Structures are given as C-alpha cells and as structure tokens.
Design a protein around this ligand. Structure first.
Ligand SMILES: [Mg+2]
Lengths: 116, 238, 349, 201
C-alpha cells in the first residue's frame, strides 16, 4: 500500500484479549491502521502489574535513535512513556496532571478536616 | 447603496434612422372583394392592437409566448420557438413556432389576435434568406434545438434587420417535400452535401424561368399599403 | 488667485479627438469579453469628452474599470483629466458623489489638483461640499502639501461657523481632521489645533468608547488623548510664542461635563478612563493655572490668523505651480512611450 | 496491457474546468454577519473570531480607502500586537485586488515583514489575509511606533549512557556533557507561513 505523502510514526499497537491490553511501541506510517502492518517491532509494554507488583516495558535505544535520525514523529502516549522513562524529556501535560491531582487531594484533605 | 445604472448611447447618422415597416397580414390577397371587408377587419385588429403590442418580427426569429390555457398548471402556457412562417390574412393570420425538446420536435400554430394569448416576446430578431423555413423538419435537430430559458437578446431600438446568411445540413434523403426543386427557390440548404451533381442536373429540368419574367401575375401594392398606412395613423390619432 | 486656479496648458495640451461613440463601443465590448484594458482608452475618452452625458458615460466606464481585472495602476494624470472634465462642465454633485464613494470609483487627486478643486469651491462659495471633501481628505491622509494651508483655513473657519452642538459622526470627523494639517509644526495655530483635536478625540472616546476612534478612522489606539493634550500643554509651557484662543474654554467645558456624573478592550491592571477622569481634571486645572502663570490674550480669532498665512501661502503656491509643471513634463515624457506601445501591437498584427 | 483514455480525458477536463471557473476569492471569503457562516461552505466560524468578524473589517476593505492601497503604509498584525508588546508590521510591496468584488475588498498582497523588530531581507506571501483582524496605523506616530532596540543538560539516562560510553573508551572526561541551545531558534506560534504551501478549495 503506497500511501501518498504521509510520514513514519512510532506508535502503540494493541494486543491481547479484552480486559488484557498489551501495548507495543513500533514504527509505521501515519496512515496505517491501529493493528496494521509495521516495519520493525521496537518494544513492548504491559499496563498490568506482574507478581512482583511492577509492570513490564522494553526499549530499543540504538534502533529508536536510528529511526528518529531517519525521521519519524511520535505519538503522545509513547513520548509520554519515554519522558517518564528518562531517555526523553518529561511531559508538560504530565506535570499539569500531577499538579492538578495534588491540588485536588489538598482540597479533599481540607474538606475532610472541615467535616471532622 | 444605490445600484449602478448602465446606459448605452449609439449615435450614427446613416445607421440610426430606419423609416418604415408594415405587417404582412394588413395587406390583402390578390383575390377580389370589397375593401370594406378589409378596412373593418383592419380597424378591429387595430383597436385590439391598441391593447396588444405584437413586437414586430420576421421568419427565423425566436418568439416566447404566454397564453391563457383553460385547464393547465396555473391556467397558463408558456412556449418558446423559432418562427417557421406567418400564414393567412386578416384576423385568421397566424404564425408557426417550433422547438426541439427532450429529443422531440414540437410545433404550434399561434393565432396572434385571439384573446386566449396574453403576451408575445421577441428573444431575438433576425431574418433568414428563405422566407419559409419548413425544411427545418428534415434538418438536423441541433439547428432547431433552442433554449426555453434564454432571456431576450437586447436589440437596438432603431436599426436595420440582422440577416444571418448561413447554410444548414440536413437529414438524409427520405424527405417529405422534395426541397430540391426550383419551384421553392430556397438556398439555406447545402446541395453539395445533401445530394449529387447528378441530382442537381436531374432537378434543373423543373426549372421554369418564365415565372419571374411574367408580369401579369405579380400584385402591385404601393398605393394600397400607403392607404393602409394612412388608415393606421388615423386610427392611432383618433 | 485666478492664475493659480486656471491653466490653459491642460486644456490646450495633447488632445486626442477620437469618436466618443467608437471609444464607448470599444470599451463596452472589451469589458463584455472581460479582458484587461489599458488606461490609454479611458484617457483618450476623457480627453475627447465635451458633454455632460459623455462625462456620465465616463463615470460608468470608470466604475467598470474599477471592477475590471486591473485596478491598481491609478494614473494621476488620467484622474486629473477626469477632474477637469467634470469641474469645467460644472457637475459638483457628481464630483462630490464620486469623492465620497471613492471606494466605488477610486479618485485620488494630488496636492495641486485638489487645491484647484477647493479654490473653485471657494469661488462658488459653498461650505458643506468643502467640509465633506476635507473629511474625505482626512480619510486620504494627504496633508504634507501646499494644500495644508487651505485645509487649515477650511477647518478653522467651518468649526467656528458650524454651530451644531451634538453630532457624533461629525464631531469625530472634526476631531480627527484637525490633527493632520497641524503636523507641520509651524506655530501656535498648528500645535494648539493639534491640542484641540486631541481634546475632541478624547471627548469622542469618553462619550462613545475607543472603538469608533480607530475602526473606520485611521487613528492610534492609545486611550490617553486627554493625557496627550496635557503633555502638549506642559511642554509648550516649558518651551517661542503661543497665540491662544478661547477653545481652551471649550476644552474646559468638555472636561467638566465629562467629570459630571460587553467587550472589554481596556487592560485590567491599567485603570479605566472612567476612573482617570478625576485626576485628568485635577492635572488639567493645574496646567491651566500654570499656563496663566506663564500668550494668554485669547482674543485673536483663529480664522482671522489664517489671513496671515495667505502671504506665505502666496509664496508656496509658486513651489506648488513648479511641482505641477514638473508633473506635466514627466507625464508628457513617459506617456508617449505608451502610444508607441500600442503601435507595437498594431505593427505586430 | 490494456490502456485507458477516458480517465485521462476526465482528469484533463476536470482540471481545466476547475482552474477556469473556480469560485472567486471574494465569493468564498464573503461572510454574513448575523449568522456567521460563509456562503458556498455552510461552515460556522470559531468562537474566538466570532466577535472580530462581527466588529472588525478586512485588509482590502481597509486598503480601499486610500490611493494605490497604501504602498508602504502601515498595516499591523492585530494578533501579533495583542500577543506581544513589541511592534510587528508588514512591508507590503505588491497588491492585487479581485475585480469581481463589489467593494474591491478582497485580493492578494504581500512584501517584507518583521517580527519583534527582526526584519528580514525577504518579501514573501502573507498569511491569513481574509481575517477580520486588520488594523491600519496612520503616517503620524510612525517613527515612535517603529522604534525598537547557553546550554542544557542531557536527560539523566542519556548522560549516564554517554558516561558509560566514554568510560568504556577509557578517557575520564569529568566535564558534564551539554548541547547548544542558542543555536536552536525555538520559534513562536505566530511566525507566519507560506500561503502557497496551503491549498485552496
Ligand atoms: Mg409526407
């Protein structure tokens, strides 16, 4: 499928049955479907915790750097995960969400102290 | 804001003044009868003309007409068509119109004095070298195929008659009238493509040149049409 | 100045003498086929006009040219052909209509041609037409010319002879027009007229907001027009001669009547003009007292002081004439190039 | 292989017809002020520009009130001057209005520009001409208006990777690695674009 224009993009592909999502960071074109074909499988991510409590994720640093040097845009969830990892800058919307959660928790504690 | 008002002025001493023009149905026929008939029918149609305008026209002109139909959509009938001919004299005078629509060639015979017709209109005024255009039946449909929504081509108030000197291609041989003969003396058709030089040589036998050379058949009119003119202007003044 | 008004050169120089009907038919068919046409046709037409109906035909053809594929060229010599053809055959209604709906016709006279037009207005002794026309020149924003003195005379006379107390459009027009003639920084008349225009603009703002100040009027957006008037007064008191008139009393009246008891364009931190009125009035009284402590005759009528300008007006009219003959020479030099240009097409054909 | 000709014919005819009788710029820029919907499109306008389209006028409508559409005359980007205190304008060089417009209130014009007093020796197409966000500055208060006057650490994981790299290489290099940031000219949103890059219906 020769897509007109377009541009490569590293994004998340979904796997696993319902109520068991398994994301896979992978490079592909902007116009490909969600579970459509790709070029090279890059890394994986499990949004569920393991027996240890932590959850799993894998990054392919050299290959991802090569792909970025070749030129490919990034999707918001995957670059957010990269920023949380540390190879990539931290996300401003992540900072805003954290600050909003902290404000809401402070407000809830204030209301609890008022009620008590 | 007020809309702009376009105005056109055309000043040419030779071209602007055209003097006179008579209708083809005011004139009488060669037949013998008392001119009292003619004059009373003329004053009748003239005191009707004081109401209805009949913008003068010619054969080969495009006429749009609105008429009062008894049983129709809105009880009116609007028809656009090419003038094939004007036939008859007196009040029974009529003009034929024709138009190809949806592939069908329709034609009407409108009488121009019945109260049933409401309005005449000249979309275009022009003249063909042939006085009779009945060969448009056998002509191609594209020549007669005209628009119904064509608004009036603006014509000057005082100008000569535009004559489109053209020729027309025709349907194949199986014609109805045998237009090839010299009895009609028509030229709008294109013989070279409609037939062969053999057919030309075969039809020239029906050439009767002496018709135009004879002079006891022609009908002089000058004094007649002058008297009719004077009757018209007298009725207009009165 | 009848010599400054009339000029036999224009009427006896380079007349075409082609058939008006032929040119009309040509232009009509060219604009019916809606292909672009040079200004040479319109110029020859206007030079050939000798009738009122012909000037009307030319007005409609100029409308068509405005709505033609070419509109920017805007040849001033053709504009003045039209202006002369209209004003010599005395259609002031048509002249005023075109000049007010310039957007419909797009006439743009220069300094000398406009001064000729306004001098003809003087000769016929009409005020409303000249007033509307100087408002349209305020729209033009063309005041760095010898016609600055004529504009000043006109406005200084008409603002006094007006005697119309309430009119928002007219008052904004006056307030905005009284500035541009005075930017030449010439004398008390100049900078005090700038002061009074600042006062009028601040009044218009305080009475109907800052929107109309700029929306359909080319002006600056700084709301502190009273502030600028105070600045002007303080710098004048610091610094020459200042021949004054009692329009400072009109300024006092406006300030006191405003001190007397939706989209938000004003900036939040910066206060509102409604809240600045008090300190505006305090500082205005302060500057009044300072000026009277410092010139303060307030007797010389300003329209009479424009007669003092008539002498150096009669000196600069010579420069204006010289520039006009320079324009004529440049026009006759570069226009003949366009006649051979049509000959190029005809020889190519 | 079987060729096909009607496809080429349709392509050519459609291209010719559209490039001939495309809708006029004025026709498709016209706006009805009480409904706030462009004709020929039936689309509504953005809430941020509703008021500006109701109140303020267009560039060519402003330029129609002065000769030659004001060559060299000051029109400033209202959006730029509300977004930044610095002066920003347009050195308009060429102008061309659309003849079909009744008020000659639409067309194309551009020249050199300037952003916060950073003038470029470059006369390029304007951006967003048809907006109702145009403000005309007079010739007075002109010079007063036109008057105008390191590095960052790498990410932690990346710097750790480079530390391991150069330690494997063998050199100490106790200096912390950095990149140039004065070179990276992060450009504001309002930096204009190329009209021709974006298409047209
Ligand atoms: Mg038969």
């Amino acid at each position: 499928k020769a897509y007109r224009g377009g541009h490569l993009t590293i994004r998340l592909a979904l796997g696993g049955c319902t109520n068991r999502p398994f994301y896979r960071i992978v490079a592909a074109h902007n116009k490909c479907p969600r579970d459509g074909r790709f070029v090279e499988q890059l890394g994986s991510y499990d949004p569920l915790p393991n027996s240890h409590g932590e959850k799993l994720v894998a990054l392919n640093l050299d290959r991802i750097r090569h792909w970025i040097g070749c030129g490919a845009h990034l999707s918001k969830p995957m670059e957010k995960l990269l920023g949380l990892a540390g190879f990539f800058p931290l996300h401003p919307m992540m900072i805003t969400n954290a600050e909003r959660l902290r404000r809401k928790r402070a407000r809830e504690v204030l209301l609890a102290s008022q009620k008590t | 804001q007020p809309p702009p008002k376009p105005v056109i002025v055309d000043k040419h001493r030779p071209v602007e003044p055209e003097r006179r023009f008579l209708s083809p149905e005011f004139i009488p026929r060669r037949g013998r009868t008392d001119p009292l008939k003619f004059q009373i029918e003329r004053k009748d149609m003239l005191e009707r003309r004081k109401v209805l305008h009949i913008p003068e026209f010619y054969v080969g002109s495009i006429l749009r007409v609105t008429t009062a139909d008894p049983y129709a959509s809105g009880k009116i009938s609007q028809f656009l068509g090419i003038c094939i001919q004007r036939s008859g004299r007196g009040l029974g005078a009529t003009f034929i119109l024709r138009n190809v629509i949806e592939g069908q060639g329709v034609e009407i015979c409108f009488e121009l004095y019945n109260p049933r017709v409401q309005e005449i209109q000249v979309v275009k005024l022009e003249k063909r070298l042939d006085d009779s255009l009945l060969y448009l039946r056998d002509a191609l449909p594209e020549y007669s195929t005209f628009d119904v929504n064509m608004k009036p081509v603006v014509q000057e108030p005082n100008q000569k008659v535009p004559v489109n000197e053209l020729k027309v291609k025709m349907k194949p041989k199986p014609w109805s009238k045998r237009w090839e003969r010299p009895n009609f003396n028509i030229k709008g058709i294109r013989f070279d493509l409609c037939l062969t030089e053999q057919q030309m040589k075969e039809a020239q036998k029906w050439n009767q040149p002496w018709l135009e050379f004879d002079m006891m058949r022609e009908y002089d009119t000058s004094k007649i049409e002058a008297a009719i003119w004077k009757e018209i202007e007298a009725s207009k003044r009165s | 100045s009848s010599a400054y008004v009339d000029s036999h050169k224009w009427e006896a120089r380079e007349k075409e003498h082609y058939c008006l009907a032929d040119l009309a038919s040509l232009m009509d068919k060219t604009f019916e086929r809606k292909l672009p046409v040079s200004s040479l046709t319109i110029s020859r037409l206007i030079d050939n006009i000798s009738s009122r109906e012909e000037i009307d035909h030319a007005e409609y053809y100029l409308y068509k040219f405005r709505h033609s594929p070419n509109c920017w060229y805007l040849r001033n010599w053709t504009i003045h052909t039209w202006i002369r053809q209209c004003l010599k055959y005395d259609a002031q209604d048509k002249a005023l209509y075109t000049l007010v709906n310039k957007v419909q016709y797009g006439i743009f006279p220069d300094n000398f041609t406009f001064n000729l037009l306004m001098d003809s207005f003087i000769k016929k002794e009409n005020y409303k037409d000249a007033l509307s026309v100087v408002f349209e020149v305020m729209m033009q924003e063309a005041f760095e010319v010898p016609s600055t003195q004529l504009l000043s005379l006109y406005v200084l006379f008409h603002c006094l002879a007006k005697k119309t107390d309430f009119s928002w459009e007219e008052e904004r027009n006056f307030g905005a027009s009284l500035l541009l003639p005075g930017l030449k920084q010439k004398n008390s008349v100049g900078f005090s007229s700038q002061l009074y225009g600042y006062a009028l603009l601040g009044k218009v703002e305080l009475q109907q907001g800052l929107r109309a100040v700029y929306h359909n009027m080319p002006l600056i957006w700084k709301p502190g027009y009273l502030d600028r008037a105070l600045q002007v007064m303080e710098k004048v008191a610091a610094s020459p001669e200042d021949i004054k008139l009692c329009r400072e009393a009109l300024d006092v009246l406006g300030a006191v009547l405003k001190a007397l008891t939706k989209l938000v364009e004003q900036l939040d931190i910066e206060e509102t003009e409604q809240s600045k009125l008090p300190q505006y009035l305090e500082r205005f009284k302060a500057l009044h007292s300072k000026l009277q402590a410092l010139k303060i005759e307030s007797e010389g009528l300003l329209s009479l002081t424009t007669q003092l300008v008539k002498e150096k007006l009669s000196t600069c009219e010579a420069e204006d004439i010289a520039t006009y003959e320079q324009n004529l020479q440049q026009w006759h030099l570069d226009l003949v190039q366009l006649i051979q240009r049509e000959q190029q097409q005809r020889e190519q054909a | 292989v079987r060729p096909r000709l009607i496809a080429e014919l349709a392509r050519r005819v459609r291209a010719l017809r559209e490039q001939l009788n495309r809708p006029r710029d004025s026709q498709l820029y016209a706006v009805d002020y009480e409904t706030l919907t462009r004709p020929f499109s039936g689309r509504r306008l953005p809430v941020r520009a509703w008021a500006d389209v109701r109140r303020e006028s267009r560039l060519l409508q402003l330029l129609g009130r002065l000769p030659l559409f004001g060559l060299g005359r000051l029109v400033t980007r209202k959006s730029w001057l509300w977004q930044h205190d610095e002066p920003c304008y347009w050195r308009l060089t060429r102008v061309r209005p659309d003849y079909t417009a009744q008020n000659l209130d639409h067309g194309k014009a551009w020249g050199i520009l300037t952003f916060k007093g950073k003038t470029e020796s470059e006369a390029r197409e304007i951006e967003h001409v048809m907006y109702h966000d145009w403000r005309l500055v007079p010739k007075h208060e002109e010079e007063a208006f036109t008057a105008f006057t390191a590095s960052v650490p790498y990410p932690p994981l990346l710097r750790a990777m480079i530390i391991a790299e150069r330690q494997k290489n063998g050199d100490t290099s106790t200096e912390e690695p950095m990149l140039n940031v004065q070179r990276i000219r992060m450009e504001p949103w309002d930096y204009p674009a190329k009209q021709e890059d974006k298409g047209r219906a």
